[PDB]
Amino acid sequence: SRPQVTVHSLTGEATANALPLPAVFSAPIRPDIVHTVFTSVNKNKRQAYAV
């Protein structure tokens, strides 16, 4: 089954209602591809400069 993460209230106390993991957290964690994608995505908001 899923680790059954606990839902918390706005004011401290952990409500006894639990939810399963959405299975997106079990995806592979690849710091290398997230690196290369970030450098290209972060260049999509550049304004052109020229003399």
């Binding site: 299975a23 995806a27 592979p28």
Partner: protein, 52 residues
């Protein structure tokens, strides 16, 4: 719903969650568990004694 699971597909067309090339992230557990330890030769010394 947004990324999908083994039940709901993706809610995005033609998309699936990525697969793993290795089933676990702890290589030490695989080596020590039951089967590799019975098929491997005995270990060395982790540092060779300087001879001559």
């Amino acid at each position: 719903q947004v990324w999908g699971s083994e039940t709901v597909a993706s809610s995005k067309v033609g998309y699936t969650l990525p697969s793993h090339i290795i089933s676990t992230s702890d290589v030490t557990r695989i080596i020590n568990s039951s089967e590799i330890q019975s098929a491997i030769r005995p270990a060395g010394q982790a540092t060779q004694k300087r001879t001559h």
